[PDB]
Amino acid sequence: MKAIIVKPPNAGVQVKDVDEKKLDSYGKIKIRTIYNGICGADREIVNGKLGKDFLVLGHEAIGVVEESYHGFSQGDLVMPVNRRGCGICRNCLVGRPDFCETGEFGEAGIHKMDGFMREWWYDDPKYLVKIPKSIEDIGILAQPLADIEKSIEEILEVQKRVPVWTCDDGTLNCRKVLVVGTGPIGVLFTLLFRTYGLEVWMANRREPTEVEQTVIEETKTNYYNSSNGYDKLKDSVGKFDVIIDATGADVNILGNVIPLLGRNGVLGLFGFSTSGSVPLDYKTLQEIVHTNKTIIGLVNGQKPHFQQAVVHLASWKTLYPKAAKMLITKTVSINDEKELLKVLREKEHGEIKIRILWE
Amino acid sequence: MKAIIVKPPNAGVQVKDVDEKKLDSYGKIKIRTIYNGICGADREIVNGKLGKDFLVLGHEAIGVVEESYHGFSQGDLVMPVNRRGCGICRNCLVGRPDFCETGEFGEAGIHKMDGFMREWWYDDPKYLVKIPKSIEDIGILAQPLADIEKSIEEILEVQKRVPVWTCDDGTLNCRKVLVVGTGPIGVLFTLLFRTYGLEVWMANRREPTEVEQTVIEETKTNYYNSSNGYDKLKDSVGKFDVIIDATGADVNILGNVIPLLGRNGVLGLFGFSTSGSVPLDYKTLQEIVHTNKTIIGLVNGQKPHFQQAVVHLASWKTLYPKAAKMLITKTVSINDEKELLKVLREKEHGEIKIRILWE
Amino acid sequence: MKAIIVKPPNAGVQVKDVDEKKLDSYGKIKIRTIYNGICGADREIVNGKLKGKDFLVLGHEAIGVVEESYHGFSQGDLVMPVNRRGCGICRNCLVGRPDFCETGEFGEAGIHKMDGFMREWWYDDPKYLVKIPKSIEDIGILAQPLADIEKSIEEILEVQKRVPVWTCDDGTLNCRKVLVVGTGPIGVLFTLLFRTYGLEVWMANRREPTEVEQTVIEETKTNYYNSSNGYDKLKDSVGKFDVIIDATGADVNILGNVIPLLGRNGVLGLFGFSTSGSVPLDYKTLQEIVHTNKTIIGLVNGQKPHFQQAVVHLASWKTLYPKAAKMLITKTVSINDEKELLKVLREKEHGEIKIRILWE
Amino acid sequence: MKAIIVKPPNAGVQVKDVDEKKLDSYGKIKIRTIYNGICGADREIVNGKLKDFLVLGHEAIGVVEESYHGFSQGDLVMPVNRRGCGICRNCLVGRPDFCETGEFGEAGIHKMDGFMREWWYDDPKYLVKIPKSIEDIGILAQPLADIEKSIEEILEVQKRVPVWTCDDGTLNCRKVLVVGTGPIGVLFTLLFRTYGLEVWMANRREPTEVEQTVIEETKTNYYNSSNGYDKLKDSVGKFDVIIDATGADVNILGNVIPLLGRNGVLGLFGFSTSGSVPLDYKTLQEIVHTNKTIIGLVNGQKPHFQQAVVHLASWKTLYPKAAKMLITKTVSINDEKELLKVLREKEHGEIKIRILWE
Ligand SMILES: NC(=O)c1ccc[n+]([C@@H]2O[C@H](COP(=O)([O-])OP(=O)(O)OC[C@H]3O[C@@H](n4cnc5c(N)ncnc54)[C@H](OP(=O)(O)O)[C@@H]3O)[C@@H](O)[C@H]2O)c1
Ligand SMILES: NC(=O)c1ccc[n+]([C@@H]2O[C@H](COP(=O)([O-])OP(=O)(O)OC[C@H]3O[C@@H](n4cnc5c(N)ncnc54)[C@H](OP(=O)(O)O)[C@@H]3O)[C@@H](O)[C@H]2O)c1
Ligand SMILES: NC(=O)c1ccc[n+]([C@@H]2O[C@H](COP(=O)([O-])OP(=O)(O)OC[C@H]3O[C@@H](n4cnc5c(N)ncnc54)[C@H](OP(=O)(O)O)[C@@H]3O)[C@@H](O)[C@H]2O)c1
Ligand SMILES: NC(=O)c1ccc[n+]([C@@H]2O[C@H](COP(=O)([O-])OP(=O)(O)OC[C@H]3O[C@@H](n4cnc5c(N)ncnc54)[C@H](OP(=O)(O)O)[C@@H]3O)[C@@H](O)[C@H]2O)c1
Ligand SMILES: OC[C@H]1O[C@@H](O)[C@H](O)[C@@H](O)[C@@H]1O
Ligand SMILES: OC[C@H]1O[C@@H](O)[C@H](O)[C@@H](O)[C@@H]1O
Ligand SMILES: OC[C@H]1O[C@@H](O)[C@H](O)[C@@H](O)[C@@H]1O
Ligand SMILES: OC[C@H]1O[C@@H](O)[C@H](O)[C@@H](O)[C@@H]1O
Ligand SMILES: [Zn+2]
Ligand SMILES: [Zn+2]
Ligand SMILES: [Zn+2]
Ligand SMILES: [Zn+2]
Ligand SMILES: [Zn+2]
Ligand SMILES: [Zn+2]
Ligand SMILES: [Zn+2]
Ligand SMILES: [Zn+2]
Structure with missing residues (x-):
């Protein structure tokens, strides 16, 4: 064989x-x-x-x-x-x-x-x-998408700790997500968060590719060039309710994005970082305590998550046909x-x- | 006035x-x-x-x-x-x-x-x-105990993310908690986790005080002298399901205890650290991802938590009379x-x- | 105007x-x-x-x-x-x-x-x-009715968090069976949505299926039961159900007929607005509800998040169930x-x- | 042996x-x-x-x-x-x-x-x-466990309500009608009051000495239901939780269902021993319209026994008179x-x- x-x-x-x-x-x-x-x-x-x-x-x-x-x-x-x-x-x-x-x-x-x-x-x-x-x-994507379905499910479960994490209209439309990294993982996180209605910003240390630009336009997602750091993003848009490290980059990427996490927010570690050591000082940690922030390691989807991925892939053929074809x-x-x-x-x-x- | x-x-x-x-x-x-x-x-x-x-x-x-x-x-x-x-x-x-x-x-x-x-x-x-x-x-303690009630409530809510975090007997008795620091906060976390039936280890860089020894004995809590680090604890007892930083110590304490966090575990940051910068390397962060670990900032109890604290203080007059008297x-x-x-x-x-x- | x-x-x-x-x-x-x-x-x-x-x-x-x-x-x-x-x-x-x-x-x-x-x-x-x-x-107009149903299923699933393990050997809900009583828009939408979530579904009505119902049955791999002569035959062949939905609008005695088919830890979901009748519940029936952790829930009205979820599902059905979607x-x-x-x-x-x- | x-x-x-x-x-x-x-x-x-x-x-x-x-x-x-x-x-x-x-x-x-x-x-x-x-009083941890599980489950189910807490973030504003005042009714009352909810106990007679002690010490209300529930409904209104702790004729349910409030829960804990209760389309449609739930409540397990122990210990301080009467x-x-x-x-x-x- x-x-x-x-x-x-x-x-x-x-x-x-x-x-x-x-x-x-x-x-x-x-x-x-x-x-x-x-x-x-x-x-x-x-x-x-x-x-x-x-x-x-x-x-x-x-x-x-x-x-x-x-x-x-x-x-x-x-x-x-x-x-x-x-x-x-x-x-x-x-x-x-x-x-x-x-x-x-x-x-x-x-x-x-x-x-x-x-x-x-x-x-x-x-x-x-x-x-x-x-x-x-496009069904082959149900496997990688499953890890992402599980991750978002868990982030939402964890946010049940917040008495009211919904918005004035009872949705999560007001919640902003920063997705750091734009490979297949970043793109799938962006597609699925937008499917759920949350606002998304994708970030990378360069301008978008053709595939990324199509995803941006079709899903009504925002994009930030992080080449010179995040100060300009913080000053323009403010802080984020969810930040996803879709990296596997140097762990110092976390030092850069942690200052952009908002009150009651979640930093979701999904990428497998491959280098570096990131310092966290007491001021940063103290502030995480005062604002009920959470950091969560996110890994591996299972059968219910594969099945949910199938439904979402099916939806994207109608909702985001150009992006779906570029997967x-x-x-x-x-x-x-x-x-x-x-x-x-x-x-x-x-x-x-x-x-x-x-x- | x-x-x-x-x-x-x-x-x-x-x-x-x-x-x-x-x-x-x-x-x-x-x-x-x-x-x-x-x-x-x-x-x-x-x-x-x-x-x-x-x-x-x-x-x-x-x-x-x-x-x-x-x-x-x-x-x-x-x-x-x-x-x-x-x-x-x-x-x-x-x-x-x-x-x-x-x-x-x-x-x-x-x-x-x-x-x-x-x-x-x-x-x-x-x-x-x-x-x-x-x-x-002892009712004055209901205010500080309220912060701790909220914190444990929150940890238990977050852990609903785990399909089964209960034990073979449907309880949390098999779950192990490391409470780092033994001031009023550490003592109250210890009393409350033991009330809930979880196994507790208190840790400090010295031997117990008389009040802490009374708590140890009465509540059937364990104690670890962490003066020379945590290797010996890790070798003897293994890893913990929950770790509470009740310190207000240099943030490098986190560096010492993070390696003792077990699969699906929670590091609860409650103390307000006052000095230091702790390095987190890629190996540490990648392992957090692979094992679904979570870090949570814990702050402030509210009215339901004060009311719960009253019930527990009342219970401790019967359950832990000697400890109660030393509060x-x-x-x-x-x-x-x-x-x-x-x-x-x-x-x-x-x-x-x-x-x-x-x- | x-x-x-x-x-x-x-x-x-x-x-x-x-x-x-x-x-x-x-x-x-x-x-x-x-x-x-x-x-x-x-x-x-x-x-x-x-006024x-x-x-x-x-x-x-x-x-x-x-x-x-x-x-x-x-x-x-x-x-x-x-x-x-x-x-x-x-x-x-x-x-x-x-x-x-x-x-x-x-x-x-x-x-x-x-x-x-x-x-x-x-x-x-x-x-x-x-x-x-x-x-x-x-098909977007269906987002409004589907919203009530999204909320309803969401609530059933929330309630069932009471059960320590309501999932199946494979971590899904695929092994859970739903009896949807009544067809037409509400029954059909409940069936579509439960099948989307992967649960097994039986639709029941006091007749054979219409062409549209038949299309839904076949495309979604749903089961159908002709309830013209009650539910004894269903109970004897298939057994009991984890969820039963009253999508009727008819006489409340329907509930007397389907309650005997509710399984351990099960949920009876009251969604239809019954329009006639009085249903007697005897002590034997109620005692058994107590012994088996059964729940009966009143299900009403979807709100904005549910409308948004409906849009995603309707979009999915154009690919998953294209024949049914056209017939909506x-x-x-x-x-x-x-x-x-x-x-x-x-x-x-x-x-x-x-x-x-x-x-x- | x-x-x-x-x-x-x-x-x-x-x-x-x-x-x-x-x-x-x-x-x-x-x-x-x-x-x-x-x-x-x-x-x-x-x-x-x-x-x-x-x-x-x-x-x-x-x-x-x-x-x-x-x-x-x-x-x-x-x-x-x-x-x-x-x-x-x-x-x-x-x-x-x-x-x-x-x-x-x-x-x-x-x-x-x-x-x-x-x-x-x-x-x-x-x-x-x-x-x-x-x-x-430790022997009570077994019966109390069934009740700990029951309240836990009611509170779990009520997570379906976007906000079931009160203006102050507690459940103090929530009202419970406990129907029947046996060991079960008494334990339900003690535990719901421990949690801070308002309680009304009801039975078809005036209170016993023991029940009167529990009423007074826990600041619980009592209603003599000998002639039905209309008077209670007129005075107090409707309840967020109703517990059937009677083991009596099921027609008790027909009497108390009309007192259940919006988003409320009817907890069936007693094992009814006789009767048949008719539920009309008006009653059922109203249950659908108001998100009401009926739940069968049975059996406590180990975590519930352990919780019962803590609460029993608390009552020696909180409600010493009632505890000495258990x-x-x-x-x-x-x-x-x-x-x-x-x-x-x-x-x-x-x-x-x-x-x-x-
Ligand atoms: N946790 C789980 O269950 C799970 C499952 C699957 C994958 N993963 C991990 O998830 C991570 C991403 O997977 P992938 O397949 O998408 O990886 P990929 O194809 O390597 O893409 C990585 C993305 O990150 C961008 N990037 C690199 N450094 C960056 C920085 N400093 N700031 C912003 N963006 C940066 C890269 O930019 P360029 O496009 O310019 O190269 C690329 O777009 C990997 O570590 C993978 O191992 C985890
Ligand atoms: N998040 C909230 O809502 C909240 C609420 C209240 C308090 N807090 C904070 O909680 C922390 C604890 O409060 P507290 O009143 O208990 O403080 P405390 O009285 O200062 O007690 C601190 C304890 O930690 C011990 N300690 C110091 N360094 C240590 C180390 N490296 N390893 C292990 N133990 C160490 C101290 O040891 P010794 O006994 O030998 O001095 C003492 O037992 C403080 O930062 C306080 O501000 C937070
Ligand atoms: N709770 C809420 O938020 C909400 C929202 C919308 C609607 N509703 C209610 O939901 C119910 C269903 O709505 P709909 O629009 O689908 O109603 P519909 O168009 O009247 O359809 C009712 C279906 O039930 C069938 N039926 C009648 N008696 C039956 C019986 N004994 N056994 C099995 N099936 C029986 C009918 O059969 P035939 O096709 O042969 O006539 C029909 O298929 C109505 O009461 C409606 O008011 C509730
Ligand atoms: N679900 C479970 O897991 C579980 C566990 C244990 C027990 N149970 C059941 O719970 C029920 C209560 O147990 P228990 O030991 O407390 O029973 P009990 O000692 O028989 O007490 C019954 C109480 O209900 C009162 N009562 C009778 N008819 C009434 C009516 N129409 N309205 C109001 N009150 C009425 C009785 O009044 P008097 O005092 O005047 O007689 C008595 O106070 C029983 O059915 C028991 O089998 C269930
Ligand atoms: O090996 C760790 C992870 O690798 C990823 O590529 C897979 O998608 C996951 O299912 C797996 O858990
Ligand atoms: O000021 C921050 C915190 O200080 C603590 O001493 C109090 O117990 C908390 O309730 C308060 O939120
Ligand atoms: O009974 C009230 C209900 O009527 C239905 O026709 C609507 O679809 C629901 O949104 C509404 O709440
Ligand atoms: O229905 C059987 C029940 O009998 C009661 O007397 C016991 O307290 C329960 O533990 C048991 O489950
Ligand atoms: Zn792969
Ligand atoms: Zn505010
Ligand atoms: Zn203080
Ligand atoms: Zn395993
Ligand atoms: Zn309509
Ligand atoms: Zn079994
Ligand atoms: Zn017994
Ligand atoms: Zn309103």
Whole structure:
């Protein structure tokens, strides 16, 4: 069977025929892969930045059900949930390994579990998300969008601590979000916050790209060039109710944006920072106490979040059609090894999502 | 009228006769002061660290209702809520200026509002908490305890974000709290978390005082001498579900305890740190993201929290009688000006609460 | 100005020119009506079955066009007004939520205290206007009825936070089953929305499905039960339900028939306004409700956040359920077509979902 | 081993010596019984209205016989009475009050031997620590737990209301009608007043001495409902919460439903024993229009037992007179005539009878 494989912690990636008998199976439903997605997580493991001699790569997949099984019909499109439980803790027991207490969960194509960059795999209906045929083209985004659905859900849950966090009209339309970083993660946070009605400012240390400019205009989102810091933003628009680090940049980015967090606000740490040490002085911390501010680490979406992502992706085909069409940057055939290895190894500037087509 | 007065931002304090006609009144009910309490906030304003020529000091008070008015009867003991709303924002409009969005609230004895260190004042029933005569002796603690009630309420609300944060028995008994600092605040956090059944470790850079040892033994609380850091605690007991900074220590304390925070955990920032700059490196912040950790600034209790505090103080007379008896360190007469000035200007080592008696 | 007017408590309805000076104004933004919707509440007032003025402007479902570029509203923007407005006194109205008004002194456009939106134009306050994307102009009128249902489902889900674990083995609510009693617009919208959220749905009515219902059933993978001879057969085959919605408007004895199908920890959601009958609840039934943590909840009125959520869902359905989405608007009647307009104002046709009025 | 035994569904009760080998064990901790409580459920089984036999009783305080992990010799403990089915997700998180299978056990009622026996073995997970400082009234933590859960659930449900708090951020302005003034009604009243809500107790007679004490000490109101509720409605108006604590004919609900206020909650806690109540379309439509809710309230679990302990401790200070009245009397296990009598029938105005093991 053709599979894209890695050998962690070593760097490297290969597309090669492997013995199906040694690959991980998870249930009774045979699924033939049609699309994989690639993200920075894949790039990390390929570059060695993170029994069996290898691991099947990939945690973003859409496949077709080969034979009808219980609720699933032949020809149905499905997406597997990538993080799976430890089987010990109560959070995993209720289907929520995003809050696993042991840290002994598996992550497909990353840790403990063969991923989905292979011709076909067997899975359990428990871990399969139904992808409507009507979103086959952009449906691969339901996996990354799921992490973002969970994050926004959690931020909203946490803000229930505030007696009234709604606005004069009972909505959240008056709440302002600063999304720091404009890769696929930043763009998806922006799309989803705007879907919920909150005001959004995207920030990056440059002018917008073509894709970003389309998102700006279509979603009625604001943009700030942060190249020379945030003073000018603070002075013009004031402070923000929510700030999202969609970075993975130097952690000093936090020192820059923390002064822009407003009373009762939330700083959501979603990016995985890769460098730096950020100093927080007593004046900054004292002020966080006085104003009921919160900092939250945000990670991993689960099945309900995948299902919510599907609904939102569907909505965006109507609401934000130009942005929706730009979510897929390009598609590489599994049979185009030179190009395939290229895109597995490194991101292109302004890339949103690269899809792998199985054919 | 005798009053304790300060003149911010300048240091200094005076006990003198002032013109009653110029003092702030808040409603129709005349209250004669019997007790005030003193805390670090009073010491700070007296020491110049934080229409009218002066401000009446003091935000912790019990008084007696001089004449019956609606629900309040002559002879009833009452305590005023100290932070009052800005009259503009939706949080203040629902009786919750602890979450004021404008920052234009008042704080008795600190900001905008004359406090309660004066022979009598007029207040509105809406801002008065009924103090049962059976807790007259320790009832003064309801004001500081209210901040702690609000804080624990808030932590427990935030933790609803975790699908299952309860234990195998449906309780929080398995959850571990590290209370850093053992002043009145640390002691009250410890008493209240033990009341709720969570396991508690108190930490300070020394061995326990006699009062702290009584609390330890009576409440079945653990203690850790953190003089040489937290490695030995971490190795023996592991990580904590909740960590409270009750310090008002250099912010580098956060650097010492953040590595002891467990998965899905909460760092509650309650103390107002007064020096230092703490570095947070990328490894620390990335781990916060991976594990759904949260940092929350905790401030100010409101009326429901004062009422809850009354119930808990009442409970502690039965549950923790020895600790309850040690909550009041000494009482100083309003007429003993030398001793009064002494205790207004500086804390005594091991002090929990000084009461001022009006007579 | 042309308006559709009624004179409660009397029956009757007229389309006539009325004095603009007489009609209620709510703010500074001039909005020109393009569409109205008609619902049962409108029918009831027209049939006479539901101070300072000789008449009331009918209608609480509307989409209008913004006449001038105001604050956050551009000329040509489509907007829908929120129909219930607060009492100005109570804490729930002061936070934008008169659905929970404590005084009962709220107003309801085209029903109670406030002129409706079946008129050429009206003035409104931006706070009460919901933006309707041009991309859903055709089905956007459904945002008003769907809002009541968004609120209702939101509330059911909030209430069920009482249950330590109401989610399923996979962390979803996919295993939860809903019985929606009654079809037509409300039942259909409840079914669409519950299916969007992933719960299993059975629709029930005392007959076989209409073509539109059949389309909804098949496209959304919903189940249907012919309840003509009661619910014994459903209970014996499928068992009990986690949520039951009364979308009836009929006799309250329907509740006697479906309460035996409510499962442990379940919610009976009362949304329809029952119009006849008395239902007896015996001690055995009530005791069992106590033993199983069951809840019965009165469900009423959506507010601005719910209107906004409805817009997103309606947009989603164009992709998820395109066949059903098209069938939501049964027909459009011109404001100028008087005989047809009076017909549709006075009576529902069998199988009707939504009739829209077009202002030309 | 001495034990109080019943043979459901048949009527009857005996105190006899029974083969210890036959009795149910639940864990490794040996607990020697000191007190039991008796309630209506006990009387029902005794009267045949609800192994060859079942050990009666689900209200117990026992003493830990040896020092175990977390439990010192001489410690007082109370067992949680309802235990899970081991299958469903609610049971698996320690909350069989919400069991989805109905295959839970209840000590001294079904599936599980009770605690009216000399001693039993239990699992530490099911034991609630009872402070020595509340030994005297501690037996009430079991019935109070059902009520702690009930109020918790009402407050959870009312989060659906955007603002259910008052002008001062409290619930002091919220009014509760507690219908029925038995041990349950009294405990509801005490707990709601502890939380600061206004309470009206109602019964179809004037108050007993004990009820009058609770009324006066807690500043609770009382309404004689002998001739219906119109007078109360005319004077006080409507209520935010109504608790049925009667166990009487369901037509009580028809009388009190018209007194429920906008956004209000009718809490069904009592187990009604007769009747049928008609609900007309006018009443039901009005419930829809005003966001009203009716909720079935049942069973407290471990966190609720622990909360009950704290509140009982608080009442020794807050409401000392009422607290001293919660225990009506104590009967020795060795006084068989009086013991059989109290197992078989409630005395008028009784709150709680305790059985002492000597
Ligand atoms: N927590 C979770 O569950 C989760 C899930 C998925 C991903 N992630 C993490 O989320 C982060 C973002 O993912 P991604 O795939 O969107 O990353 P990406 O493609 O690398 O994009 C990063 C974005 O940040 C911008 N940026 C870099 N430094 C900046 C700065 N100092 N200020 C403002 N913007 C700056 C970059 O600008 P240019 O476009 O000019 O390069 C780029 O637009 C990564 O750390 C990823 O690992 C977390
Ligand atoms: N957020 C709010 O609403 C709110 C309300 C009230 C008070 N506060 C703040 O809460 C903090 C505590 O108040 P308090 O009255 O208890 O203060 P306090 O009387 O000054 O007590 C401070 C405690 O921390 C101990 N400590 C100092 N450095 C430490 C370290 N490095 N590690 C561990 N313990 C250390 C002190 O030790 P020793 O006993 O050896 O001196 C003392 O026990 C203050 O900053 C106060 O301003 C906040
Ligand atoms: N709570 C709120 O905020 C709110 C808002 C809007 C509407 N409502 C109420 O919601 C209800 C439904 O509205 P609608 O506009 O959908 O009403 P509708 O057009 O009258 O439709 C009612 C449906 O119920 C069916 N039905 C009648 N008797 C039945 C029975 N015994 N069993 C099962 N189905 C039965 C009817 O069958 P046929 O199709 O064969 O006639 C029809 O499909 C009405 O009472 C309305 O006033 C409440
Ligand atoms: N849901 C649960 O988890 C749970 C837990 C424990 C108990 N319960 C049930 O809760 C109910 C109350 O328990 P309890 O032990 O307090 O019962 P109880 O001792 O029988 O007390 C019943 C009270 O209701 C009064 N009453 C009777 N009819 C009345 C009426 N029409 N109006 C007003 N009051 C009336 C009785 O009056 P008199 O004093 O004059 O007789 C008595 O005060 C019972 O049904 C019990 O089974 C439920
Ligand atoms: O491995 C950590 C995270 O990596 C991301 O790329 C995935 O989208 C998440 O599902 C995962 O939890
Ligand atoms: O002034 C800030 C804080 O000071 C503390 O001493 C009081 O207890 C708080 O209620 C107050 O909000
Ligand atoms: O019963 C009052 C209700 O009438 C319905 O027609 C409307 O859609 C609701 O918004 C309104 O609250
Ligand atoms: O309905 C059964 C109930 O009986 C009551 O007497 C007990 O206090 C509850 O714990 C139990 O759940
Ligand atoms: Zn990915
Ligand atoms: Zn786990
Ligand atoms: Zn103080
Ligand atoms: Zn304010
Ligand atoms: Zn309508
Ligand atoms: Zn109102
Ligand atoms: Zn009992
Ligand atoms: Zn169970």
